[PDB]
Design a protein around this ligand. Structure first.
Ligand SMILES: CCCCC[C@H](CC(=O)NO)C(=O)N[C@H](C(=O)N1CCC[C@H]1CO)C(C)C
Ligand SMILES: [Zn+2]
Length: 164
């Protein structure tokens, strides 16, 4: 099913997620709804928190053809290096984009859809995406990186939409 993405200033987006106990059939069902919502909203990644599900689950799919799924359950950052930044938009901040400073390279460890642990070295867009989803699980949004004035402008611009 398609799940409802929370938008600022919904306080639930600021909720820190607890680890997934064991990857079971219910966890795997949450992974599907998440992917389904991700593809529906034309997003390249998604974290459970945006859907009001407070567990450490993240789905990412960067393929043009939508057939290269990446599941990150209980992800942990092992190492990071460099700086970079692209204009990022967030489904929770409806239709806004901004350049956000991010580490250029990251090495993580996580459990896949079957609960099997795996390590991953990411660079480029994958590295930035992982960082942005992981931020979600800890109640953090890309605009938190911005100045008070920009955060203010983002908040006021979002506040003109959501209706329509
Ligand atoms: C790379 C930054 C985070 C990617 C994940 C988000 C979706 C999201 O809210 N995840 O929490 C997304 O699809 N963002 C898109 C996005 O920012 N993209 C699409 C690919 C390129 C990059 C824009 O510069 C927009 C268009 C919806
Ligand atoms: Zn987001």
């Amino acid at each position: 099913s398609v799940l409802q993405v929370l938008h600022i200033p919904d306080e639930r987006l600021r909720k820190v997620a607890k680890p997934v106990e064991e990857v079971n059939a219910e966890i795997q069902r949450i992974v599907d709804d998440m992917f389904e919502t991700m593809y529906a909203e034309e997003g390249i990644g998604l974290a459970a928190t945006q859907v009001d599900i407070h567990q450490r689950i993240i789905v990412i799919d960067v393929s043009e053809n939508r057939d290269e799924r990446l599941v990150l359950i209980n992800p942990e950052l092992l190492e990071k290096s460099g700086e970079t930044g692209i204009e990022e938009g967030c489904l929770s901040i409806p239709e806004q984009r901004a350049l956000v400073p991010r580490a250029e390279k990251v090495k993580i460890r996580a459990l896949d859809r079957d609960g099997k642990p795996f390590e991953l070295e990411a660079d480029g867009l994958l590295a930035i995406c992982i960082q942005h989803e992981m931020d979600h699980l800890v109640g953090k949004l890309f605009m938190d990186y911005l100045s008070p004035l920009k955060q203010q402008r983002i908040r006021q611009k979002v506040e003109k939409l959501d209706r329509l």
